[PDB]
Symmetry: C3
């Protein structure tokens, strides 16, 4: 129309040509490495410039002018087929996934560029965020048996309904509840079921008993992202890092968006419920990120909280968005930039934790706290609080930049 | 189109059913579900009509945003100009004579309306400006206040001294519990304090109580009148919204005047610093007020709480403002779980600047009134309030609040 | 075209007639002083009204529809020539600068009105802010020699590259690093060089050894604005108060905006780096304001922090924007409105300072902290943090109002 799509198509062609004619990654010469790096850079710069003016038109083709809610996975897949060279195809990602991270060309970065541009749009952004708040198909599929049975066993999460509480137990006993793509799917499924189940009034997140010998018999909340999978190239930008932030973690804040199915939808299109978190052992990385979103947080006297995501190379999700509000900008930089670790019994733990109780009194204090969040008044108040604490624009703008900043960190030399 | 026609139909089915059905509380199970269903269909259409037509509606009522109408006048004019969108004065009269439990909930329609108005980037700021303008009552009382320095109201006693507007909340029988009259007296007093050129600083304090448990003792505020709430005397528009957009917002941003003085081009609103002194306790609406003052003092024996949650409603704009003072953990402890903060515990310093023994309190109040005098304080507190609470932030909150609070006003746990 | 430019031209003409025919400032009568004050007020009111509707058109003429980046000094100069009477000429400002503050007509206020209107625009505002993030010509000029030698000596700042650290030493040993127009130019130049030098990974700001007899041999961070120059009329609204906020202080937050010169510009158009501050003695006023944008802050056990500006009659830069986020609204008003002074060893110092060290361990603790901020991961995380903490709209809206509020404080009576 005015040159950008054609110039991008060309820049992507030069990339495919070099990737076809050059040696494999570990065999390229210094001159060859600079040649491909420059080609990638020229294509990505044009991906940004194309979308600065054409993002809404692209999103409209993919969503039929914002009448079809597409989740992240479906969105980036449809974008690849409808706009070749804008974002990688399923195949090109398949090739990337079989390689070690160091040998990857970095095609996920193109998805970072795309999702940044979509979320920056005041029209496309809120619509994509709504799509991710809708219930997952898996959860709709499991909902009737959960209502009948009160119990669902998944690979990384055990869900149980007892006394109007949805009890989510993170139960990866071999690896201290380290996070991967499967844990995100199980968590979102369980969060969806907790919110849609009419016999659930409050949610509870806790780590289960561990089996690994260093922690046998001990509960552990979360050791954060699976560093092995990160190194091997098993951590997906879209299906893990973005999915968790826009899916289950955002649903803890704002609920699940339903269809116009029920009375009161005109005032409450989303079903939200209060959430309690109980921390045993420690909350590290992604686990600690979760605590910034709960209505009540309890911890054992011996627990600690840290975000070592820094020195590790990557951004701790939306902790950079939320932590300042809890601890102020000095402490939030101490934790995020310099890896400060906060112990449950030091005074500043009160910035993250409501109750710190000795292991022998912890179970009973958890139970008491589940009784204190029951009514419709709690729902209205937590909704107004979350609206004040984190505006839709605030969250949307952060996740937009995050999509690309985190994509780049995923492929940095660190 | 038809958007307005379908609403007109849905409201007609409501009026039909209300005319032919039994009085509330002797309707059968089938009858109660039918009217509930009719209300729901009408309210759903009120929302969608206004999602696309709010600006056009507001423009008809305000002559394209060239007439400032306050809340009461706005919803009245909306009812006559758009029958079935919001209740008439009469229908509200009928609602008010009933107990909360027997009400049909017509105030919810006003919640729907004010939500849509405040959501508009054009209508919203204009309505908020209208509510920052001086009340007619205050313009009426201003000359005598300037001459006399003294105005005795129902729940408030204004008094000018050494350049201080001394507001004393003086409902000695009921611990300064809030009602529609107290809001009118407070806004009137705040308007006079800001318009009186001999006033440099404002002071809010509770007066000596007469009720026997507190005779001789000052008490700041026991919050909303729970008796009146149960009886249906708490108005969504004239109490809950009026206080947030009127006097409480004026404490933050001042009164908007006409272009009738020098410097209006840079300061269209007259704002002044405010000091609050808490005796006994600040509960509910009283505690909400502390989040808006430039200095807060409290007696050693005072406490602060927002039981508005336990009651069944939202504590005004505390959900907007408290997180900024105490962070999201403490603010949920106070609002969701009813935590009560004592003047002498460390975290009181998140809400209170000075905690003084009763015998040194009067003198510490006086000293604090001398420290906020200049034009430099005005400029700095204006920049601080602009940073702390953006116009969009407040507008977006009050928009959702208008409807969320309307629904809580008619929820079943409140009808206790 | 709508009457506003002509009415402004008239109002400015009546000002000029009166200034030509009236006595000099200290010889005017009561009636004469009221008349010129009224003429100024009418002209300034029209400057505001003209720009409320015409600001974008004005900015577009000056910047060729936002395709030429002009810094503040160049912008207001071009505006004076292209729109006579909107803002003062270089000629008129020269006359103002030759007078004491009390005798000035206040023409800088017109620049406050102009910059407020520009920054309020969602189109012009971000574009002006980008222009001020671009490298200064002086820094581009000094960059090659800095890369070669690793060392630059300026009047108020000594810059040294060492172990990948840009070491900025504020070195006004005679006056405790009091700020003036030259210090702003040196600071922005040094910050530009630190960001553009590829051998610089982290920045460090510290005060040098003092020579004044009360502090001989002792380091001092900053005593804030030069109060002597303020009284004499040597503090420029544009070249000092606005320049520092939109130039080097904003560059500490967001980096320098470069040309499309380098790989990765499509994702990082600005070069940002982490900054460490080390406070010896005290940080007062503008010095304390700087601590609010650093990534790590260290302080001597004996240091204190204060913003006595308010007591002086002026606003402490963007402290009113940033401080609440560090200390909450109670403490931020205690510091800004009531002049509270925070000592490095009291508990609430931890709201501003990461480490408080005894003088004998301070040098080594500074060195340790410089090694801890090296990677690309730190860069991405501090970028996301700063985006969350302070939005572009938030900063832009604040600086817009600040431009005029601070201009008025510059000419208020308690400042003179
Ligand atoms: C220090 C300690 C807490 C305890 O140390 P013992 O000596 O008590 O424990 P053993 O080490 O014996 O524990 C038994 C087994 O569990 C494994 N394992 C542990 N954590 C992880 C992990 N994050 N990813 C993968 N595996 C993990 C451990 O490697 C070992 O493997 P073996 O059985 O093959 O030997 C430990 O967990 C520790 O050092 N943890 C490191 C945690 C860490 O740095 N996490 C990264 C934070 S960063 C993070 O989460 C980024 C993030 C960003 C986002 O945008 C979203 C998100 O969701 C996450
Ligand atoms: C705990 C204590 C404060 C003290 O307990 P003693 O034992 O010291 O005190 P006695 O109970 O003897 O009190 C002496 C006299 O004062 C009367 N009275 C007090 N408050 C109210 C009221 N709100 N409405 C009406 N009357 C009231 C009390 O009835 C009695 O009069 P008699 O003798 O004529 O019966 C107690 O009063 C107490 O629990 N009060 C309820 C406090 C409370 O939770 N209020 C509502 C919070 S909720 C709130 O404010 C929501 C709110 C939301 C908004 O969006 C805006 C807004 O503006 C408000
Ligand atoms: C408190 C103390 C530090 C006490 O220290 P001793 O009493 O032991 O030390 P001596 O005071 O003798 O120190 C030796 C010499 O240093 C000179 N000097 C010092 N400060 C300044 C200054 N701000 N401006 C100019 N000169 C200054 C002073 O003249 C003196 O005499 P010599 O002329 O013979 O050299 C004192 O200096 C003191 O009270 N300082 C005032 C601090 C103050 O109010 N600052 C302004 C706050 S307000 C402020 O910064 C507003 C502001 C707003 C903005 O938007 C941007 C911005 O950048 C600033």
């Amino acid at each position: 129309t005015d040159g950008l799509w054609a110039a991008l198509t060309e820049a992507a062609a030069s990339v495919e040509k070099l990737l076809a004619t050059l040696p494999e990654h570990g065999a390229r010469s210094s001159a060859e490495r600079a040649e491909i790096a420059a080609a990638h850079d020229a294509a990505r710069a044009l991906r940004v410039r194309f979308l600065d003016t054409h993002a809404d038109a692209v999103y409209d083709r993919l969503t039929d002018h914002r009448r079809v809610h597409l989740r992240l996975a479906e969105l980036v897949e449809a974008a690849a087929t409808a706009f070749p060279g804008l974002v990688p195809t399923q195949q090109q990602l398949a090739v990337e996934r079989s390689l070690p991270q160091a040998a990857k060309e970095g095609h996920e970065i193109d998805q970072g560029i795309f999702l940044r541009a979509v979320l920056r749009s005041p029209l496309a952004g809120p619509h994509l965020l709504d799509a991710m708040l809708r219930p997952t198909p898996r959860a709709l599929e499991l909902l009737p048996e959960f209502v009948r049975t009160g119990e669902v066993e998944m690979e990384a999460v055990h869900l149980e309904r007892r006394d109007g509480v949805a009890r989510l137990t993170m139960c990866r006993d071999d690896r201290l509840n380290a996070e991967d793509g499967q844990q995100v799917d199980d968590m979102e499924t369980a969060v969806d079921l907790a919110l849609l189940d009419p016999g659930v009034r409050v949610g509870l997140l806790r780590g289960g008993v561990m089996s690994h010998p260093r922690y046998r018999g001990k509960r552990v909340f979360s050791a954060g992202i699976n560093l092995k999978y990160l190194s091997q190239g098993g951590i997906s930008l879209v299906d893990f890092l973005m999915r968790r932030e826009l899916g289950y973690i955002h649903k803890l804040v704002r609920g699940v968006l339903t269809n116009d199915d029920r009375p009161g939808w005109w005032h409450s299109p989303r079903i939200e419920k209060p959430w309690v978190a109980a921390v045993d052992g420690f909350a590290i990385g992604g686990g600690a990120q979760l605590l910034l979103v709960f209505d009540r947080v309890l911890a054992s006297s011996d627990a600690y909280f840290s975000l070592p995501c820094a020195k590790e190379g990557i951004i701790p999700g939306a902790a950079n968005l939320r932590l300042g509000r809890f601890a102020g900008p000095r402490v939030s930089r101490q934790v995020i930039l310099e890896g400060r670790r906060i112990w449950a019994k030091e005074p500043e733990a009160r910035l993250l934790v409501d109750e710190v109780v000795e292991p022998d009194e912890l179970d009973a204090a958890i139970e008491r706290s589940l009784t204190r969040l029951d009514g419709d008044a709690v729902l209205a108040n937590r909704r107004m609080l979350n609206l004040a604490d984190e505006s839709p624009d605030g969250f949307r703008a952060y996740m937009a930049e995050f999509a690309l900043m985190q994509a780049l960190r995923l492929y940095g030399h660190d």
